[PDB]
Design a protein around this nucleic acid. Structure first.
Length: 290
DNA sequence: GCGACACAAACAC
DNA sequence: AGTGTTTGTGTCGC
């Protein structure tokens, strides 16, 4: 009924089938590590502006809620939240140096203003994009929004336990204890240590996330989870690392820039999950029917 | 099959 | 130790 795997940090992931077993909404058993991500590809090379040294990049993603490993499939529920978190790392460049440097895209060089992550859902069989929606903790009593592009600086990915503990914190003292894990406050650095052209100072806002945290995410409510044959559709969640540049023939999305003009989110790397099954609202997807 | 509303159970404090 | 919060899912009604 419950299959348990030991996580990297010593917590457990407890996989169970909601067709057979109903667990409380807030039980820690709803938190678990989801499917591992795999490289789709690398795109545009990035180089440090004087040395010309290639910046090596790696997305570090994990799902921390919403997916169970049930007999060789990864299974989510349309009605329920998932959590997807990601950082990235630069194996050849320590953070302190990285933030003081400046970087170009090797397409012919476009200056990187900042690095950012976006997420996407796709039909894994035909590459069609599927809309995602997020809620706040207030859910129907608050706004719905689509996942946004998240400016980020390189950081280790927090342990599963940490994501779990920070999920619904309000108290100011607890927030202070997690602040350094999730944010860099540019306004608190010594400005005199930085050149005008430094990467840190072309980020759009003073509060810069170290971790992209997409919580309370769902597939759009209109998504069809079965094919006409009644076979399950296969979905996949994608994490894309990009460099945002000022465009004033490679893969990119347009981005609503800070000053208001047309910006470019140039793809650097993309990872994705293996195929995912999503269970819809049918009564037979729930243990109540039995 | 979807939007809305309701109930309930463990969490956060 | 009690109050209000968060989120899985039961249900209505179109």
């Amino acid at each position: 009924v419950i299959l348990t795997q030991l996580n990297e940090d010593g917590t457990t992931s407890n996989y169970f089938d909601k067709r057979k077993l109903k667990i409380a909404p807030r039980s820690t058993l709803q938190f678990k590590v989801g499917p591992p991500f795999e490289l789709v590809r690398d795109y545009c090379p990035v180089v440090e502006s004087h040395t010309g040294r290639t910046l090596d990049l790696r997305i570090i993603p994990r799902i921390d809620r919403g997916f169970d490993h049930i007999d060789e499939e990864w299974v989510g529920y349309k009605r329920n939240y998932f959590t997807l978190v990601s950082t990235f790392e630069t194996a050849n460049c320590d953070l302190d140096t990285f933030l003081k440097s400046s970087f170009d895209l090797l397409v012919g060089r476009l200056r990187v203003q900042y690095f950012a992550i976006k997420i996407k859902a796709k039909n894994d069989d035909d590459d069609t994009e599927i809309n995602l929606v997020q809620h706040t903790a207030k859910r129907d009593k608050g706004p719905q929004f689509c996942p946004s592009v998240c400016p980020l600086v390189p950081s280790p990915l927090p342990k599963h336990q940490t994501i779990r503990e920070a999920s619904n914190v309000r108290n100011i003292t607890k927030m202070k204890k997690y602040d350094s894990t999730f944010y860099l406050h540019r306004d608190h650095v010594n400005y005199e240590e930085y050149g005008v052209d430094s990467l840190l100072f072309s980020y759009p806002e003073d509060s810069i996330q170290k971790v992209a945290r997409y919580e309370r995410v769902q597939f759009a409510s209109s998504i069809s989870v079965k094919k006409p044959s009644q076979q399950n559709k296969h979905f996949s969640l994608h994490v894309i690392l990009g460099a945002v540049v000022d465009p004033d023939g490679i893969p990119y999305d347009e981005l609503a820039l800070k000053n208001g003009s047309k910006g470019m989110f140039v793809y650097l790397q993309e990872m994705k999950t293996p195929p995912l099954i999503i269970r819809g609202r049918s009564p037979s997807n729930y243990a109540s029917s039995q």
